[PDB]
Amino acid sequence: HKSEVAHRFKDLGEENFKALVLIAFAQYLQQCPFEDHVKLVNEVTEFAKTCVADESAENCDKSLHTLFGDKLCTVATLRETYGEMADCCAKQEPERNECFLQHKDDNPNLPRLVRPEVDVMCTAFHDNEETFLKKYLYEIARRHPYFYAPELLFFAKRYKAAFTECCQAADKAACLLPKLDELRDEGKASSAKQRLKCASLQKFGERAFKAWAVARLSQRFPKAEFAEVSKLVTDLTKVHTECCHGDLLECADDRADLAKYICENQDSISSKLKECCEKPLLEKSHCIAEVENDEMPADLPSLAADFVESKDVCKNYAEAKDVFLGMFLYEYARRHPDYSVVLLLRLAKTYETTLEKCCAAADPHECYAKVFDEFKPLVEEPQNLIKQNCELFEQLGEYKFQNALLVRYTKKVPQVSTPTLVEVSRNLGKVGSKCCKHPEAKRMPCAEDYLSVVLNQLCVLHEKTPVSDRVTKCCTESLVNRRPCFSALEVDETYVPKEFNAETFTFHADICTLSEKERQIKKQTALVELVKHKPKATKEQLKAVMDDFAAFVEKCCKADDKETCFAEEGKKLVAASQAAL
Ligand SMILES: O=C(O)C(F)(F)C(F)(F)C(F)(F)C(F)(F)C(F)(F)C(F)(F)C(F)(F)F
Ligand SMILES: O=C(O)C(F)(F)C(F)(F)C(F)(F)C(F)(F)C(F)(F)C(F)(F)C(F)(F)F
Ligand SMILES: O=C(O)C(F)(F)C(F)(F)C(F)(F)C(F)(F)C(F)(F)C(F)(F)C(F)(F)F
Ligand SMILES: O=C(O)C(F)(F)C(F)(F)C(F)(F)C(F)(F)C(F)(F)C(F)(F)C(F)(F)F
Ligand SMILES: CCCCCCCCCCCCCC(=O)O
Ligand SMILES: CCCCCCCCCCCCCC(=O)O
Ligand SMILES: CCCCCCCCCCCCCC(=O)O
Ligand SMILES: CCCCCCCCCCCCCC(=O)O
Numbered sequence: 001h002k003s004e005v006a007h008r009f010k011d012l013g014e015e016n017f018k019a020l021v022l023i024a025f026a027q028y029l030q031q032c033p034f035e036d037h038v039k040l041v042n043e044v045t046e047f048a049k050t051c052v053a054d055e056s057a058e059n060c061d062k063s064l065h066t067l068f069g070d071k072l073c074t075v076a077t078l079r080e081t082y083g084e085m086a087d088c089c090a091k092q093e094p095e096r097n098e099c100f101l102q103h104k105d106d107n108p109n110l111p112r113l114v115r116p117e118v119d120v121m122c123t124a125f126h127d128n129e130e131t132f133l134k135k136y137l138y139e140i141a142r143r144h145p146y147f148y149a150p151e152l153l154f155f156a157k158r159y160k161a162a163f164t165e166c167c168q169a170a171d172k173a174a175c176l177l178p179k180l181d182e183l184r185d186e187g188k189a190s191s192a193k194q195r196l197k198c199a200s201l202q203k204f205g206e207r208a209f210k211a212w213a214v215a216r217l218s219q220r221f222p223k224a225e226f227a228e229v230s231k232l233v234t235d236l237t238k239v240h241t242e243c244c245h246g247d248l249l250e251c252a253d254d255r256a257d258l259a260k261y262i263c264e265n266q267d268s269i270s271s272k273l274k275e276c277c278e279k280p281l282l283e284k285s286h287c288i289a290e291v292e293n294d295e296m297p298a299d300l301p302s303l304a305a306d307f308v309e310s311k312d313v314c315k316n317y318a319e320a321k322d323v324f325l326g327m328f329l330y331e332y333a334r335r336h337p338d339y340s341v342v343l344l345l346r347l348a349k350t351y352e353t354t355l356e357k358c359c360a361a362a363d364p365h366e367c368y369a370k371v372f373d374e375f376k377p378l379v380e381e382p383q384n385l386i387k388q389n390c391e392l393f394e395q396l397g398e399y400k401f402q403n404a405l406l407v408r409y410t411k412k413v414p415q416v417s418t419p420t421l422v423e424v425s426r427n428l429g430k431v432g433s434k435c436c437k438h439p440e441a442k443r444m445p446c447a448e449d450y451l452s453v454v455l456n457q458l459c460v461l462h463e464k465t466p467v468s469d470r471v472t473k474c475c476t477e478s479l480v481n482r483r484p485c486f487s488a489l490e491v492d493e494t495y496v497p498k499e500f501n502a503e504t505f506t507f508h509a510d511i512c513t514l515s516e517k518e519r520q521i522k523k524q525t526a527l528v529e530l531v532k533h534k535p536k537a538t539k540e541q542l543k544a545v546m547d548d549f550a551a552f553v554e555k556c557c558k559a560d561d562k563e564t565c566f567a568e569e570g571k572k573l574v575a576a577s578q579a580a581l
Contacts, residue, residue, distance in 0.1 A: 207322070235258050314364045352554070
């Protein structure tokens with residue numbers, strides 16, 4: 001109302017307010033120590049409480065943008081430490097605010113955050129939970145300055161749930177370590193996803209983005225009328241566009257206003273939002289973004305009537321090409337929550353190509369009579385890819401599925417570095433476990449959701465240091481062609497076997513003494529090097545060498561004086577292996 005900071009403090013509650021202020025400041029003042037940020041937070045919090053006590057107390061009617069900038073410009077070492085950023089303080093609002101957005105550091109050169117020992121974590125968590133939690137919130141925020149602050153706070157609350165539970169349990173390490181792995185992977189995916197949607201808006205443009213949203217919103221809210229979906233898609237593009245411009249408060253206000261619109265209109269949208277729409281502002285937009293798909297209307301026609309049979313198909317199309325194509329996308333996607341959005345975009349684009357050709361024909365109805373037959377192969381290709389891979393994740397388990405991928409992908413693009421081949425192949429196997437566990441109807445969307453970040457990881461890595469033309473081609477293909485292109489890659493014909501290196505296939509007794517993870521990575525590193533040396537080896541021959549090594553490790557980890565039969569019984573492996581292939 002009169003005091004933005006008082007209204008924020010009253011909507012958020014003191015605990016959330018303090019945490020969000022810490023995140024916000026940590027993301028701009030990335031090189032100031034924890035101590036100094038605790039101080040900014042306590043000052044902003046005591047100021048906010050004076051505004052809550054009296055909205056017309058001094059400085060309480062200042063904009064939150066103004067107060068944020070004022071406190072940044074108050075920092076004593078700002079020019080010494082952040083240089084150019086201090087020059088933003090010479091400008092007036094709103095130009096000061098825009099100058100700060102430009103001058104955050106993407107890659108602050110901070111050491112990797114090392115996971116301490118369970119004992120050390122659980123003790124620190126016990127002795128001062130808030131300093132432990134807030135210090136890690138600070139460490140993560142300074143390192144991820146574009147991470148949406150409310151989403152970083154939702155992660156913090158899950159970390160705190162994981163410590164509260166696990167620091168009291170019998171086997172602390174057995175409880176905690178898997179939860180921290182899941183959270184790390186979920187957090188990294190959310191950080192990659194957030195960056196990619198903004199890069200993609202810029203790369204592929206606003207039209208592609210609105211198509212993507214029509215498809216997603218129609219799957220989620222299949223009972224909403226097209227005009228409601230189109231209104232939601234218009235507001236969603238504005239939210240996403242503001243959010244990518246990088247102003248946290250503008251992004252939060254835009255999200256909150258859309259959340260409120262959706263909650264005020266549940267009857268026109270979904271029967272699934274009641275619980276989300278009872279949450280406080282902080283959790284409401286988060287909650288909606290995760291909501292389950294509504295059930296579609298039971299009694300939906302064939303799309304044939306409006307999109308093939310109707311004699312007004314070309315007239316309807318020519319009148320507003322993107323609205324008609326959007327209506328097609330809406331009707332297709334509301335019927336297929338089991339499809340990837342990109343599959344729905346391939347279908348939409350196939351229909352566009354066909355109406356473009358055939359609406360420029362004397363008997364349009366004849367030219368486009370059988371358009372629906374072109375959808376058959378497009379739909380099956382990813383359905384088959386999922387069946388074949390999710391039934392291999394069955395036969396094998398996660399680890400041996402990663403191994404099957406390792407051999408498949410090393411043979412397709414053997415020029416890729418071993419660490420990239422091991423990383424992507426491990427990650428693609430963990431996409432198996434996230435998504436092959438889901439029923440049929442959720443498999444292709446789960447797969448899409450996780451492949452988009454996995455293949456972006458692989459591409460970004462790749463275009464910073466290229467190695468393969470065919471990878472570059474798939475990475476610079478259209479949105480809809482990227483995955484099909486990767487899946488179309490054939491075993492590399494032109495690749496020359498890599499010259500045998502004796503070191504690479506030398507193992508010691510330490511291998512018996514590594515975590516499960518490090519031992520899998522050492523083995524997977526060797527496997528890739530095996531395929532790189534002998535790319536001609538077949539399934540039968542590689543299984544034979546793998547089973548030989550498998551039998552070697554088990555024998556040479558049981559034996560007395562292990563490190564010798566590793567040297568000795570291990571040179572027998574490497575000779576027997578070379579000949580055999
Ligand atoms: O690109 C990255 O930097 C990344 F986001 F870390 C990613 F590794 F690609 C990832 F998608 F997060 C992921 F961790 F591989 C994963 F989430 F897909 C997973 F495989 F671990 C899960 F199981 F979550 F799918
Ligand atoms: O690969 C891309 O860059 C792309 F933009 F995603 C696309 F393939 F062109 C598309 F977005 F799907 C699309 F074809 F333009 C469309 F399907 F979105 C549309 F044109 F049909 C509609 F009007 F439906 F938005
Ligand atoms: O974009 C999607 O993937 C989606 F599924 F359509 C959606 F995420 F539900 C969303 F509805 F678009 C949305 F962004 F989550 C939202 F609008 F519902 C919101 F409430 F989160 C915001 F806050 F954006 F309003
Ligand atoms: O078709 C499939 O099996 C798939 F799983 F959907 C796929 F993920 F797209 C993939 F094609 F396997 C792949 F992961 F994209 C890839 F093979 F292209 C690669 F990323 F692993 C490499 F590095 F080999 F290019
Ligand atoms: C999100 C704020 C609080 C986070 C508390 C967790 C700190 C311990 C784990 C940090 C190490 C990096 C994450 C990981 O690899 O699991
Ligand atoms: C002066 C420092 C104030 C900065 C605090 C930022 C507060 C963010 C509010 C987030 C509200 C949630 C909205 C949403 O994502 O739907
Ligand atoms: C081995 C890859 C991940 C595990 C599940 C198999 C995924 C293959 C199909 C993915 C296709 C969805 C996106 C698309 O339509 O292009
Ligand atoms: C000249 C080639 C040396 C032969 C050594 C092969 C090492 C690779 C085996 C990788 C094992 C993965 C599967 C398993 O656990 O058995």
